[model samples]
Target: GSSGSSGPARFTQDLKTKEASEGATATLQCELSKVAPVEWKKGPETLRDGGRYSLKQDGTRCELQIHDLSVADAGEYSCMCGQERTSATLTVRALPARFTEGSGPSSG
Candidate 1:
């Protein structure tokens, strides 16, 4: 048997948008290897409500998704796998209306 010891868990993730509008949808993605039963979590408690979290295992790709983001949802998030060791961080931000540029019609 090749049973010695498994390597340490290492994982990193990048979000689609560090900040997003109140009513906009946001997504987070992470790349992982050699694991099972992936889990996703968010903090601040409030944001975790009324949100959809999903993790998909396609071959060797680990995908994470969060839909319908809100201002209360802005906080730190983590993605874990394999004994809850390997985890990724996510930061959600609130977008302001003043930053809107080309939101009006006839701006083409």
Candidate 2:
């Protein structure tokens, strides 16, 4: 089924910005109708499913997932289907660690 109220060539999912911390995962999804050969990319580099990256597609639903995020993973991600295109930006930040009393290191 088409996601947007528009025609089949329209995108029904929202490709808004996303944020994730280091060692976490992020995902971006979009839907397209009457299109073939979906492609995903990060900046100018092409994306492939393996290691810390994975892509899934079922009917019109397409998703891209990234695991174990790092500083280099923070960037713009795009999904394309023929003439249709959608994108979202991912910002990765470092998560602060917690230490118990008399454990780990003490900070001033």
Candidate 3:
């Protein structure tokens, strides 16, 4: 009885970006730290060739870049290297003025 269950790939700590903010640039950097080519993908969507998404490989490490952060960009991201894989998530929030301290006044 062979269940289609496969072993898991342990992932290391993930790189962080600036706190979620609209129009913010969030850059996620992931390192394979092993002998494997890092594969990057955004959510259920595959990065299109020559598209807004950018992926660069530096040796065993990979950098995922997304410009003009949007609400849709907020999701879990995973990087894979052979049987090893790591993931991180970036959250983008709406305009900050909406959540600014409550104050209504007129300046003279």
Q: What would the per-residue lDDT of candidate 2 be over residues 1-108, giving only the tens digit for each residue?
A: 646654435456756546788888887767766555678888777877788788887777776788888888788888777666788888888776775466577789
User: lDDT for each of the candidates?
Assistant: 0.53, 0.75, 0.65
**lDDT of candidate 1 over 1-108, digit per residue (tens):** 643677544453432334556666666656554444455666433222333765566543555556767767676666555544333344556666585567656755
- Top model number, lDDT: 2
- Which 10 consecutive residues of model 2 have the lowest summed lDDT? 2-11
Q: Residue 17 CA error for candidate 2 (Å)?
A: 5.0
Model 3 poorest 10 in a row by lDDT: 7-16
lDDT of 2 at 1: 64
Instruction: Tell me the deviation in Å of residue 66 in model 3.
Output: 0.4
Model 1 poorest 10 in a row by lDDT = 42-51
